[PDB]
Ligand binder design. Structure first.
Ligand SMILES: *[C@@H]1O[C@H](CO)[C@@H](O[C@@H]2O[C@H](CO)[C@@H](O[C@@H]3O[C@H](CO[C@H]4O[C@H](CO)[C@@H](O)[C@H](O)[C@@H]4O)[C@@H](O)[C@H](O[C@H]4O[C@H](CO)[C@@H](O)[C@H](O)[C@@H]4O[C@H]4O[C@H](CO)[C@@H](O)[C@H](O)[C@@H]4O)[C@@H]3O)[C@H](O)[C@H]2NC(C)=O)[C@H](O)[C@H]1NC(C)=O
Ligand SMILES: *[C@@H]1O[C@H](CO)[C@@H](O[C@@H]2O[C@H](CO)[C@@H](O[C@@H]3O[C@H](CO[C@H]4O[C@H](CO)[C@@H](O)[C@H](O)[C@@H]4O)[C@@H](O)[C@H](O[C@H]4O[C@H](CO)[C@@H](O)[C@H](O)[C@@H]4O)[C@@H]3O)[C@H](O)[C@H]2NC(C)=O)[C@H](O)[C@H]1NC(C)=O
Ligand SMILES: *[C@@H]1O[C@H](CO)[C@@H](O[C@@H]2O[C@H](CO)[C@@H](O[C@@H]3O[C@H](CO)[C@@H](O)[C@H](O[C@H]4O[C@H](CO)[C@@H](O)[C@H](O)[C@@H]4O)[C@@H]3O)[C@H](O)[C@H]2NC(C)=O)[C@H](O)[C@H]1NC(C)=O
Ligand SMILES: *[C@@H]1O[C@H](CO)[C@@H](O[C@@H]2O[C@H](CO)[C@@H](O[C@@H]3O[C@H](CO)[C@@H](O)[C@H](O[C@H]4O[C@H](CO)[C@@H](O)[C@H](O)[C@@H]4O)[C@@H]3O)[C@H](O)[C@H]2NC(C)=O)[C@H](O)[C@H]1NC(C)=O
Ligand SMILES: *[C@@H]1O[C@H](CO)[C@@H](O[C@@H]2O[C@H](CO)[C@@H](O[C@@H]3O[C@H](CO)[C@@H](O)[C@H](O)[C@@H]3O)[C@H](O)[C@H]2NC(C)=O)[C@H](O)[C@H]1NC(C)=O
Ligand SMILES: *[C@@H]1O[C@H](CO)[C@@H](O[C@@H]2O[C@H](CO)[C@@H](O[C@@H]3O[C@H](CO)[C@@H](O)[C@H](O)[C@@H]3O)[C@H](O)[C@H]2NC(C)=O)[C@H](O)[C@H]1NC(C)=O
Ligand SMILES: *[C@@H]1O[C@H](CO)[C@@H](O[C@@H]2O[C@H](CO)[C@@H](O[C@@H]3O[C@H](CO)[C@@H](O)[C@H](O)[C@@H]3O)[C@H](O)[C@H]2NC(C)=O)[C@H](O)[C@H]1NC(C)=O
Ligand SMILES: *[C@@H]1O[C@H](CO)[C@@H](O[C@@H]2O[C@H](CO)[C@@H](O[C@@H]3O[C@H](CO)[C@@H](O)[C@H](O)[C@@H]3O)[C@H](O)[C@H]2NC(C)=O)[C@H](O)[C@H]1NC(C)=O
Ligand SMILES: *[C@@H]1O[C@H](CO)[C@@H](O[C@@H]2O[C@H](CO)[C@@H](O[C@@H]3O[C@H](CO)[C@@H](O)[C@H](O)[C@@H]3O)[C@H](O)[C@H]2NC(C)=O)[C@H](O)[C@H]1NC(C)=O
Ligand SMILES: *[C@@H]1O[C@H](CO)[C@@H](O[C@@H]2O[C@H](CO)[C@@H](O[C@@H]3O[C@H](CO)[C@@H](O)[C@H](O)[C@@H]3O)[C@H](O)[C@H]2NC(C)=O)[C@H](O)[C@H]1NC(C)=O
Ligand SMILES: *[C@@H]1O[C@H](CO)[C@@H](O[C@@H]2O[C@H](CO)[C@@H](O[C@@H]3O[C@H](CO)[C@@H](O)[C@H](O)[C@@H]3O)[C@H](O)[C@H]2NC(C)=O)[C@H](O)[C@H]1NC(C)=O
Ligand SMILES: *[C@@H]1O[C@H](CO)[C@@H](O[C@@H]2O[C@H](CO)[C@@H](O)[C@H](O)[C@H]2NC(C)=O)[C@H](O)[C@H]1NC(C)=O
Ligand SMILES: *[C@@H]1O[C@H](CO)[C@@H](O[C@@H]2O[C@H](CO)[C@@H](O)[C@H](O)[C@H]2NC(C)=O)[C@H](O)[C@H]1NC(C)=O
Ligand SMILES: *[C@@H]1O[C@H](CO)[C@@H](O)[C@H](O)[C@H]1NC(C)=O
Ligand SMILES: *[C@@H]1O[C@H](CO)[C@@H](O)[C@H](O)[C@H]1NC(C)=O
Ligand SMILES: *[C@@H]1O[C@H](CO)[C@@H](O)[C@H](O)[C@H]1NC(C)=O
Ligand SMILES: *[C@@H]1O[C@H](CO)[C@@H](O)[C@H](O)[C@H]1NC(C)=O
Ligand SMILES: *[C@@H]1O[C@H](CO)[C@@H](O)[C@H](O)[C@H]1NC(C)=O
Lengths: 453, 107, 132, 132, 53
């Protein structure tokens, strides 16, 4: 009995952690028509209904979202998909040429003085012998002066030439799902107060994550998830001043953006099978596009956020909000996309308040841009064709990104400013409750039994 | 050097008697040790390896035990072939040393 | 009907019990291994990886002379040099992960002994059958 | 400790000994068959071909009813036509490579005999177990 | 074997089109002498002798 011999088992439930390539999965509903869109191509296998969830008990596991994989992976995938979609479209090389430009005095309000320019130039036709004279309109933030007479040139001409966007394509995001192949498992921590790093006792396993909607924004987050208990704050090392802070809300807030102006369209021929789209004529009075939010909602939400934040820097402290410090036009202002357009809104009127110890609507203006270089790359620009008719969309605000400014001694006061700029954090705000593990079926143990001859 | 003491220096007993031999080390060496046996005219060989593993081919009547600075070899039943000399050797850091040597005699 | 629900036995979720109870429920896991332009290339890599992983385990089980079963015995004797404790505590209060981290160092030798043991067994049996 | 190196028993280097010794070291060689944008395709093809080869010879062994074992006897008698010789010289002096070269002509003839022998044997014993 | 070019060179850049640069040799500062290579003699002689044998 005391003496014993080794024994072998198979299919033992033990696992470790590693990394591997994931794959996609899309709802069949999207497969129903809608053949034109940057994402949501048909290669994704159709999903399956009635997902199942298995509960575990007596387990405890450590999570660390800061040093997490499968973030850069989907970042790279998104960039590659964008580049692939953009490939087959006409080029825009011949437009680099001197222009003759003037103002536009058509009952413009005083705030728009010099914000539209009427320009004309020469351009070759299909037959290489002839040339023709054409004209168009432009915004101030796309043309530059060089040196009486008046002349102007494009802004990207000396840097690079880039492709005009194809006409029929859709930028609307849709839900997507991530799934792992056989021989791997995906674990989720269901604790409703887990602060993003450390132990977690309540765990479960799944095969495919819930829906995800890729969105591009800065200084805010739109159409995210909603917490369940209260506003939560997350960070790597809150004591350090060089790391951003993510704030996730408990309830949503509503926002309305609109461009009341009206536009038409026109087409021009450049060469064999080469078309070009240009702005037409305006019909009536013109006004600046703008956005609205409520007042009381914002007030109470800020109050709750301050109250929650107070639990780290002592109750005897002062808080002051300040606008963006300053810099280039891409981080200093909140940029977003709605209906195939790009706005740039000045958020000076939202972080202007102070807090000490113990039906009106806020309206803000925006501006329009037509040449874009996103993902902070160089040598790759785009052209956005104009659209006809007014536009208006509505969305939800769900999260904020803040950065604490430096201080001196204990001045019983602190300041925060909006930050951001890197799109990694936007992905990181979602995939902080998922881990990937690998199985190890073999096993060995001693046993009193002995093999028979 | 690491001095190793073998006890008894010599012994005399009849055949079949249960006997013990002890090897003591100057300082702690863990369990990097071995025991060899020899008779005059024949090359030495290793009887016990590591003081815990039985060398292949040896009779089971021999048993080795101990650790640190105290190790023991026990013969349950002496045999005519067991009247030989023994040496406890240390496979530790340099240099290399060997025991004084203990003899078994028939009375 | 009105109160009757459904209670199935799922994937790996018994990993919170003693060392012994878990072994009663193993078969299920064994039946879940071979389940079956840049946006679609990686699937081929995944499939190749999966099949290679399965084949490696099949071969390794084949060599040790225990293929076709889930519980197989052998002849190699256990040694207390590798580990301590007694049968009672081991099979009453422990978890598989704890054992894994316990025996992590001494694995290659434990693997190695089995094939030479099997080879000796086969060689002896061959002569036993061939002597007549 | 100090003063002891490390000895292994590696790859094909044992392929110059006589008939008898080499068959001791079979297992290791058998273990070394499944080791693990235009460059990826060719290596993927190579891996696929290796897997296919392994599956092919595994199946071929399976047909002859000796699966899961490294040695297996069978009923087909040995005709003296192919090479008379005698047991002592073949099992003492001849090496593997020269033997393979010298019996390289009558492989296909040999395979069919094993196949049919197994088929007939299984068919016969089926009736015996059926009447049971 | 030691081989060298002793002359001095400058460099220049010219723009052709959108983000297109082209490098053209600039001017020279001093006199010009021919680049050349050197080897030993005795080593060569003995090596040829051994090869012949
Ligand atoms: C965060 O989440 C919020 C909430 O979901 C989201 O707001 C919603 O965004 C979606 C997607 O843009 C909005 O849906 C769009 O709504 C308008 C109008 O379409 C509606 O109304 C018309 C008229 O009743 C209906 O026919 C239509 O089915 C919709 O109900 C447009 O932006 C889009 O509609 C297209 O189709 C209409 C069909 O009539 C056209 O009239 C319209 O011009 C649009 O273009 C279509 O035709 C074009 C050819 O002429 C073609 O090129 C286009 O591809 C397209 O087919 C679209 O339905 C929804 O209304 C928003 N909800 C609210 C309350 O505002 C936010 O967008 C999201 N955040 C971000 C940043 O995206
Ligand atoms: C942005 O910059 C562009 C640069 O091209 C300007 O475009 C030109 O603007 C002028 C002035 O509005 C346009 O002239 C208009 O043309 C149309 C047809 O008139 C033509 O034919 C008549 C008869 O031969 C000519 O007299 C006349 O000069 C034109 O050649 C009509 O929209 C207008 O005609 C009206 O006035 C004329 C008298 O001037 C009357 O004879 C007509 O019956 C009628 O009442 C007007 O003359 C010119 O055509 C535009 N060129 C192009 C290529 O479009 C934009 O005006 C400027 N500002 C914007 C867009 O706001
Ligand atoms: C932006 O914020 C607004 C305000 O909160 C938000 O509207 C809310 O949306 C949620 C989520 O869609 C609604 O809650 C659930 O939504 C769906 C609706 O089908 C269901 O899960 C739930 O509905 C149940 O009851 C319905 C009865 O008609 C059934 O049809 C359905 O099957 C379910 O049983 C549930 O309503 C929430 O009600 C609205 N609130 C409103 C309209 O006041 C909006 O969705 C946010 N934006 C985005 C893009 O999410
Ligand atoms: C390869 O082989 C070639 C050919 O043998 C060899 O070129 C030699 O280089 C040396 C070093 O520069 C030359 O020596 C110079 O020759 C003239 C005449 O004397 C003068 O420039 C120099 O003498 C004085 O003149 C200078 C006045 O301004 C002084 O500043 C200087 O210090 C001297 O006092 C100097 O001697 C030599 O003439 C050539 N040619 C030959 C045939 O030797 C070359 O160096 C070898 N190595 C390499 C790497 O090429
Ligand atoms: C499109 O190309 C045409 C043809 O080159 C340009 O018209 C020409 O512009 C030049 C430069 O201004 C003019 O040159 C000089 O003009 C005055 C006229 O009094 C005088 O100094 C000389 O006679 C000389 O020609 C030229 O007249 C003019 N030609 C014509 C036929 O009008 C035109 O400017 C280009 N348009 C655009 C929008 O780039
Ligand atoms: C999180 O941020 C805090 C600061 O907000 C970091 O605390 C400080 O970290 C530094 C750098 O590692 C420590 O080093 C040195 O300590 C002494 C005393 O201050 C002095 O030589 C230097 O000024 C320097 O700071 C420091 O001890 C530590 N504590 C304090 C009070 O400054 C913290 O390390 C950051 N991250 C982590 C993971 O802890
Ligand atoms: C964001 O809030 C601003 C400020 O309230 C809104 O602007 C206001 O919108 C209303 C409703 O369209 C305008 O009333 C209109 O005025 C004239 C008559 O005076 C006429 O167009 C209509 O009959 C209507 O009564 C109002 O003038 C306008 N301005 C102000 C200062 O209130 C804006 O519409 C809001 N944006 C969105 C997208 O809701
Ligand atoms: C952003 O635009 C939306 C959509 O117009 C605005 O919400 C809408 O506000 C109107 C005016 O109050 C609501 O219409 C009427 O109001 C009351 C209920 O509030 C009631 O008499 C009727 O049900 C009627 O609809 C309309 O319901 C409401 N839209 C909804 C609830 O979907 C919103 O106010 C705008 N944002 C801001 C900050 O003003
Ligand atoms: C974002 O919008 C805010 C809205 O307040 C802008 O802040 C305002 O900017 C003006 C200057 O543009 C500040 O000065 C005022 O304007 C002129 C010239 O300075 C003059 O009439 C007055 O002396 C006055 O100072 C104005 O005070 C400031 N508003 C507040 C409440 O401080 C801000 O400039 C906009 N940001 C961008 C980047 O456009
Ligand atoms: C950021 O918050 C500050 C503090 O509330 C705002 O400053 C306040 O702005 C209003 C509107 O311009 C000032 O009212 C002005 O007061 C005097 C007469 O008392 C005169 O300049 C004007 O007739 C007007 O009524 C108010 O005094 C001023 N308070 C200060 C400086 O303490 C600021 O406008 C906010 N920024 C934004 C973009 O909303
Ligand atoms: C090719 O280039 C090499 C590398 O510069 C030359 O080697 C150099 O040869 C000279 C002359 O023999 C060496 O100088 C002598 O070195 C020792 C003291 O270190 C001694 O013999 C003399 O006092 C004198 O300084 C020099 O060290 C050596 N350089 C190196 C880096 O090894 C070689 O001469 C060139 N060959 C021809 C054919 O020009
Ligand atoms: C037309 O647009 C030009 C710029 O393209 C305007 O020129 C400037 O206008 C501002 C605002 O009135 C003045 O402060 C500047 O002095 C003007 N000159 C420069 C060099 O910036 C011009 O005012 C606009 N209006 C007209 C009638 O030409
Ligand atoms: C999130 O919670 C963790 C766990 O409480 C906090 O980090 C712990 O800090 C204590 C006190 O220094 C250490 O003893 C623990 O070892 C830490 N655990 C981990 C997992 O880091 C962490 O500070 C919290 N984060 C924020 C932003 O508040
Ligand atoms: C968890 O631990 C308790 C206490 O040892 C044990 O009784 C129980 O069976 C374990 N497993 C569960 C609750 O699944
Ligand atoms: C500008 O105002 C004039 C004078 O009222 C009017 O005739 C013209 O149509 C207006 N133009 C636009 C584009 O509103
Ligand atoms: C803030 O007040 C709370 C009230 O519960 C108290 O526990 C905490 O110590 C106070 N912190 C300070 C004064 O920093
Ligand atoms: C196992 O050994 C431990 C430690 O000595 C002891 O407490 C326990 O009773 C033993 N159990 C047995 C022999 O079943
Ligand atoms: C095998 O046969 C050869 C050739 O006849 C002979 O020389 C040799 O002795 C034989 N060996 C045996 C019977 O062991």
């Amino acid at each position: 009995a005391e003496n014993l011999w080794v024994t072998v088992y198979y299919g033992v439930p033990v696992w470790k952690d590693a990394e591997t390539t994931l794959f996609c999965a899309s709802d069949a509903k999207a497969y129903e028509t809608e053949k034109h869109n940057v994402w949501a191509t048909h290669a994704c296998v159709p999903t399956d209904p009635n997902p199942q969830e298995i509960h575990l008990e007596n387990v405890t596991e450590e999570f660390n979202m800061w040093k997490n994989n499968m973030v850069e992976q989907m970042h790279t995938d998104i960039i590659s998909l964008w580049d692939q979609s953009l490939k087959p479209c006409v080029k825009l090389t011949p437009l680099c040429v001197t222009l003759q430009c003037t103002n536009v005095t058509n009952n413009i309000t005083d705030d728009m003085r010099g914000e539209l320019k009427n320009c004309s130039f020469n351009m070759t036709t299909e037959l290489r012998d002839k040339k023709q004279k054409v004209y168009s309109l432009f915004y101030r933030l796309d043309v530059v002066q060089i040196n009486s007479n008046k002349e102007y040139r494009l802004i990207n001409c000396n840097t690079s030439a880039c492709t005009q966007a194809c006409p029929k394509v859709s930028f609307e995001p849709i839900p997507i799902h991530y799934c792992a192949p056989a021989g791997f498992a995906i674990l989720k921590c269901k604790d409703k107060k887990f602060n993003g790093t450390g132990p977690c006792p309540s765990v479960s396993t799944v095969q495919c994550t819930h829906g995800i909607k890729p969105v591009v924004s800065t200084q805010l987050l739109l159409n995210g998830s909603l917490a369940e208990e209260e506003v939560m704050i997350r960070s790597e090392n809150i004591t350090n001043n060089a790391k951003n802070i993510l704030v996730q809300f408990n309830t949503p807030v509503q926002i309305n953006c609109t461009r009341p102006n009206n536009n038409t369209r026109k087409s021009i021929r450049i060469g064999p099978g080469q078309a070009f789209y240009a702005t037409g004529d305006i019909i009536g009075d013109i006004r600046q596009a703008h956005c609205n939010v409520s007042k009381a909602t914002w007030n109470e939400t800020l109050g709750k956020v301050v109250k929650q934040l107070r639990k780290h820097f002592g109750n005897n402290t002062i808080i002051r909000f300040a606008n963006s410090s300053g810099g280039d036009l891409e981080v200093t202002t909140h940029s977003f996309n709605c209906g195939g357009e790009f706005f740039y809104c000045n958020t000076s009127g939202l972080f202007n308040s102070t807090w000490i110890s113990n039906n009106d609507s806020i309206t803000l203006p925006c501006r329009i841009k037509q040449i874009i270089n996103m993902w902070q790359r160089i040598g790759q620009c785009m052209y956005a064709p104009p659209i006809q008719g007014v536009i208006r969309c509505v969305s939800n605000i769900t999260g904020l990104i803040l950065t604490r400014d430096g201080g001196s001694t204990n001045s019983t006061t602190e300041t925060f400013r909006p930050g951001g700029g890197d799109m990694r954090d936007n992905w990181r705000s979602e995939l902080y409750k998922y881990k990937v593990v690998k199985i190890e079926p073999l096993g060995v143990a001693p046993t009193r039994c002995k093999r028979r001859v | 050097d690491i001095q190793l003491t073998q006890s008894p220096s010599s012994l005399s007993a009849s055949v079949g008697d249960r006997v013990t031999i002890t090897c003591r080390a100057s300082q702690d060496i863990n369990t990097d040790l071995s025991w060899y046996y020899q008779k005059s005219g024949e090359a030495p060989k290793l009887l016990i390896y590591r003081a815990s593993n039985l060398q292949g081919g040896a009779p089971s009547r021999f048993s080795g035990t101990g650790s640190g600075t105290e190790f023991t070899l026990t013969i349950s039943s002496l045999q005519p072939e067991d009247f030989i000399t023994y040496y406890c050797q240390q496979r530790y850091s340099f240099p290399i040393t060997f025991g004084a040597g203990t003899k078994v005699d028939i009375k | 009907a009105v109160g009757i629900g459904a209670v199935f036995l799922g994937f790996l979720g018994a990993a919170g019990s003693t060392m012994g109870a878990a072994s009663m429920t193993l078969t299920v896991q064994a039946r879940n291994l071979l389940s079956g332009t840049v946006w679609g290339i990686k699937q081929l890599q995944a499939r190749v990886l999966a099949v290679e992983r399965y084949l490696r385990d099949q071969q390794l089980l084949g060599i040790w002379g225990c293929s076709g079963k889930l519980i197989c015995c052998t002849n190699v004797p256990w040694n207390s040099s590798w580990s301590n404790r007694n049968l009672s505590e081991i099979w009453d209060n422990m978890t598989w992960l704890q054992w894994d981290k316990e025996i992590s160092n001494y694995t290659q030798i434990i693997y190695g002994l089995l094939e030479e043991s099997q080879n000796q067994q086969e060689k002896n049996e061959q002569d036993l059958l061939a002597l007549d």
